[PDB]
Design a protein around this ligand. Sequence first.
Ligand SMILES: CC(C)[C@@H](C)/C=C/[C@@H](C)[C@H]1CC[C@H]2C3=CC=C4C[C@@H](O)CC[C@]4(C)[C@H]3CC[C@]12C
Ligand SMILES: CC(C)[C@@H](C)/C=C/[C@@H](C)[C@H]1CC[C@H]2C3=CC=C4C[C@@H](O)CC[C@]4(C)[C@H]3CC[C@]12C
Lengths: 266, 275
Amino acid sequence: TLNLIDLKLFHHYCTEVWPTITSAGISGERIWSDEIPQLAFDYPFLMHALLAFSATHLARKEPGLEQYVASHRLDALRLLRKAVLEISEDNTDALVASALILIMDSLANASAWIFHVKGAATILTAVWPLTEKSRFHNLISVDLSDLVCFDESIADLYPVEIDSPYLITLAYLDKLHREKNQSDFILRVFAFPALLDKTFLALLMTGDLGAMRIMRCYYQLLRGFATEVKDKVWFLEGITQVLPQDVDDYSGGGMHMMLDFLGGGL
Amino acid sequence: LNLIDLKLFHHYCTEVWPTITSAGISGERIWSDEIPQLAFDYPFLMHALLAFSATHLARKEPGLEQYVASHRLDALRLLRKAVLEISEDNTDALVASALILIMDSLANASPSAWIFHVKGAATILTAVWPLTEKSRFHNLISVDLSDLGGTVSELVCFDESIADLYPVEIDSPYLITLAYLDKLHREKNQSDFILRVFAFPALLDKTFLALLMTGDLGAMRIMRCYYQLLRGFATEVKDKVWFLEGITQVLPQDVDDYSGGGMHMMLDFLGGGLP
Ligand SMILES: CC(C)[C@@H](C)/C=C/[C@@H](C)[C@H]1CC[C@H]2C3=CC=C4C[C@@H](O)CC[C@]4(C)[C@H]3CC[C@]12C
Ligand SMILES: CC(C)[C@@H](C)/C=C/[C@@H](C)[C@H]1CC[C@H]2C3=CC=C4C[C@@H](O)CC[C@]4(C)[C@H]3CC[C@]12C
């Protein structure tokens, strides 16, 4: 029929939106610049996810368009969770990029945002780990090949001994704070709860005290970081209205906040 | 969700505009961003844009030449209509679609229908001329704003002479075209020369062009000089500029070897006896 709307939205992505991604701290410029756009021609679910994020960013200076954010994301999730079942090595990078786009898109609106966030972040978990052939490998995770939270110290947790179910997560979280300033920190701290190891995660959803103390320290880092770049990164603006400072101020309290971002399932 | 037009349009903003800039055309933000943003408001330009880009992506992928045709004719049909409501809002969109359609017709030349298409496309330039200097596109013309001076300048054609047309009078119906043709030779190497040289027969003053359509031999010798200018520049960039490849196997060297002789070649390329 000829569609100038998606044409406008896609042109907007390769002109105005991808630099939006790179100046928030993400690296791999040609990832966002050209590799993701051509990936979208082979995988519809990525194209819809690109298009929706694009409309979301443009709808800041044009009305209309908010019915185009809704169409493209529903279509993106529909095709995602079946693409999510035949996960392949030809379509994992397309699946990670869609999840990252969907995360930034959901983050830019402020119960539904949580529901898309959680769904989007389930794609990261189902693809984890990535071969290091993936364009996306060092942008979402941290180097774990080697050997504190002022408000709620997790010091009565070290020493960590080798068979602790906290070892991996404490290491991960420790490495995550010291690249607080290296490239791709946005993606790594967003991707963290989605890449927890299976045993820690099982411990968490039972309410293990130690696992929750560790996650609340993570939360200070994530909210701290968001508090500090909200000014700069358009798709994080006003996320700290959504994320309360006392996570016990969520409405079931901190434990239902934990459950609503980690629970559910098919 | 139509990913062919999305692939075609991404192909324009990444691979094809660099190819316009690189042939000698100026105003890189006109082609890289200003023309795409115009395409969203005027369907006829989008079609011309995607047709030209399919044309270009058809050099390395099969298929696609079903989509060159589709978009071209939908461009031509919408333009037909848009060129009647010619406005300040849509002059630049008209101009860019013509120039796109001209490069596209010239790339598919490699009446045998490109002529008809160039002719039709070039009608849009005529219908829009002259341009306010508000137009992004005041780069299809020379400036005839200066003058000459103790008398200064006389154009000289080599294979045939327009030497006996001198010195030209003020009331001469050759003055405007001869000055335009001399300045055109003088910016043979400045930017946007290919657009200027292509636009030239579309921007002739109506008096000179009625003289042409009646067979004035003076007007015809001048245009024979322009042809040497255009065929000479074309045969010498045709292997660097992709949409001009093979153009010399379609524009003969001796214009008397066209189908009905040079007289017919002239008139199959123009459009309508001026009042
Ligand atoms: C926004 C994207 C990056 C997604 C992935 C992150 C959401 C954050 C806000 C979610 C992910 C895990 C959630 C989380 C896990 C565990 C608990 C322990 C509980 O005792 C208090 C709530 C708490 C601490 C919650 C708070 C909200 C968290 C930290
Ligand atoms: C390809 C686009 C740019 C269109 C506009 C240009 C077509 C060219 C090839 C056409 C335009 C005017 C034509 C033209 C006009 C007048 C004459 C005089 C005649 O005694 C010989 C043929 C000749 C010289 C022809 C040759 C072909 C010309 C030069």
